[PDB]
Structure formats: C-alpha cells, structure tokens
C-alpha cells in the first residue's frame, strides 16, 4: 500500500516493460536500472513467447478482468513467493495491458503498472526488501 523507494523501484521497471511491450519502442534508456531491465525484459519475453496461447485462452474465459488482477496475484504467491512466480505475473500483466490496449481505450492501460505493483507489494514487500529488491533476481 505504502509508496516508498521499494514501490517505485519495482514500478519503474514494470512501467517501462509494459510501455516497451505495448509500443514496441526501446525503453532501455528511460529506466533507472538498465541491467535489471534487460534481465527482466528477457525473462518476460521468454514466458510470453512460450505461453501467449494459454494467456489468450484464459483471458477470453474471464470477463471483468481489471478488478480481478489483485486476486490473481494473491492466489499466485499466497502460499510461497518466488521470482519465477513474480516474473510470470509481470509477463501476464504485460499481455493483459496490450490486450486492453488493442481493445482500444487507454485509461486502464495507464493503471496496470500500479495495479500489479500494488498487488505485488501488498504481499511481497518484506520478501522483496530482504533481497534488496531486484538484486535477489540477478
């Protein structure tokens, strides 16, 4: 809930990956931490490339998906938090953002980064802090 350095340390990377994934424009020179961005950018691009089809099916199966993001995140890492699950959330979050973008109206797209970062931190802050945020992912 609280917007700290941690909240924005994560948001900066998610916000720019969503931007890059939706527009196809390079964001390596807008992010604060360039090395993390490349790693996370590639991690999510692998998950998407291998699971975009499943995402397409699960997404058409779910009406009213914007207000269900916090529940999906909650139900993904409530028993345990791992970087694999955290990355999968970001990747699936990226796909949804593009999907709502191609559906055409942006007001939701402007919120997806904060929505998942909020849901992510609502349960994983101490876990993220105890690894110095993205340092644990290297």
């Amino acid at each position: 809930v609280k917007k700290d350095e941690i909240y924005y340390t994560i948001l900066n990377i998610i916000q720019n990956y969503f931007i890059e994934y939706c527009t196809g424009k390079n964001r390596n020179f807008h992010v604060e931490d360039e090395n993390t961005y490349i790693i996370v950018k590639n991690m999510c691009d692998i998950i998407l490339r291998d699971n975009i089809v499943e995402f397409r099916k699960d997404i058409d199966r779910c009406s009213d998906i914007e207000n269900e993001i916090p529940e999906i995140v909650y139900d993904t890492i409530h028993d345990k938090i791992t970087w694999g699950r955290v990355i999968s959330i970001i990747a699936f979050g990226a796909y949804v953002t593009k999907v709502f973008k191609e559906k055409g109206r942006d007001n939701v797209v402007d919120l997806m980064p904060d929505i998942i970062t909020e849901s992510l931190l609502s349960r994983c802050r101490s876990w993220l802090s105890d690894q110095n945020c993205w340092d644990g992912l290297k």
Partner: peptide, 21 residues
C-alpha cells in the same frame, strides 16, 4: 476462472524457475 489463471501462473513460474537456477 480467476483461480485457473492463478494456478497456471504457478506452473509457469515454477517450471521457469527450475530451468534457470
């Protein structure tokens, strides 16, 4: 529905995690 998504993000997250240290 929303629970199926969650469980597939866990399969994806767990397999992704095992194959990369």
């Amino acid at each position: 529905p929303e629970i199926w998504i969650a469980q597939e993000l866990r399969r994806i997250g767990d397999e992704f995690n095992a194959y990369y240290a």
